[PDB]
Write a protein that binds this ligand. Structure first.
Ligand SMILES: CN(C)CCCOc1cc2c(cc1O)c1c3c(c(-c4ccccc4Cl)cc1n2C)C(=O)NC3=O
Ligand SMILES: [Cl-]
Length: 250
């Protein structure tokens, strides 16, 4: 098998994803091995197609190769040795020491540049959340292109409900880029030290009214006001990724 022959498997890093050394080049890669799926195959192939047009950007995880063997599909991507934002947030949570305002702005700006790049390729990510942001200056890179779709798709697989804009839940796909913007604000909120976001119920709905969850630290008004517009109930009111990256607060 290509996998066994080309790569030395170092360890499992996600449940599968493995940290591997490619034997010829001496580099370390993250390789996802999933069972080969149909509508499910189309969804698997969009991940690959997305990766293969989104390999030029410093804030999107680099793709190297993908292949099929057995009943598995394989994707070999850039290894980010800092883990995901989810783990850094969860460690912060235990130590009661969060991203400070300067680091939240950096997080927001870097990921915002990633979205800006995705969105200019007429693509939307649709699953922005801390577990899909990888850490390599710390560098943040968007990864997990499993929900990537073209921006005017009439059908969307919705991402994690914690980060899901209401209009996407209502199957209104008229402004899909602003769904990524909404999820990015909530991502930054979690990095700021917020409690686990709700999945349904009255707290879920409340955020989708444009009320920011409680943040256990004091932030500038100007920064809080940017995060809050990013979760505006009206997606049109939310900044584009380009407007976000040029924003004076950043
Ligand atoms: C506790 N923590 C500090 C480190 C332990 C786990 O570390 C990692 C897990 C990881 C990745 C990188 C890591 O450093 C990691 C990467 C990636 C993926 C991934 C997600 C979706 C599709 C394909 C892949 Cl390879 C999934 C990944 N997982 C589950 C990736 O593309 N590039 C990555 O570095
Ligand atoms: Cl997450």
């Amino acid at each position: 098998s290509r996998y066994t022959t080309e790569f030395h498997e170092l360890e499992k890093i996600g449940s599968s994803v493995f940290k591997c050394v490619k034997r010829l080049d001496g580099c370390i890669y993250a390789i996802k091995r999933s069972k080969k799926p149909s509508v499910d195959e189309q969804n698997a192939l969009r991940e690959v197609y997305a990766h293969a047009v989104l390999g030029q950007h410093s804030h999107v995880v680099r793709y190297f190769s993908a292949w099929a063997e057995d009943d598995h599909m394989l994707i070999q991507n850039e290894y980010c040795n800092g883990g995901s934002l989810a783990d850094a947030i969860s460690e912060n949570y235990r130590i009661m020491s969060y991203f400070k305002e300067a680091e939240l702005k950096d997080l927001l700006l870097q990921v915002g540049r990633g979205l800006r790049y995705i969105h200019s390729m007429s693509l939307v990510h649709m699953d922005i959340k801390p577990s899909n942001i990888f850490i390599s200056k710390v560098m943040f890179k968007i990864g997990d292109l499993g929900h990537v779709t073209r921006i005017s798709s009439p059908q969307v697989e919705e991402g994690d409900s914690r980060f899901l804009a209401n209009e996407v839940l209502q199957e209104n796909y008229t402004h899909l880029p602003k769904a990524d913007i909404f999820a990015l604000a909530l991502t930054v909120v979690c990095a700021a030290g917020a409690e686990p976001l709700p999945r349904n119920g009255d707290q879920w709905h409340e955020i989708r009214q444009g009320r920011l969850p409680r943040i256990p630290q004091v932030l500038s008004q100007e920064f809080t006001e940017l995060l809050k517009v990013m979760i505006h109930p009206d997606p049109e009111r939310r900044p584009s990724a380009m407007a976000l990256v040029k924003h004076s607060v950043l």
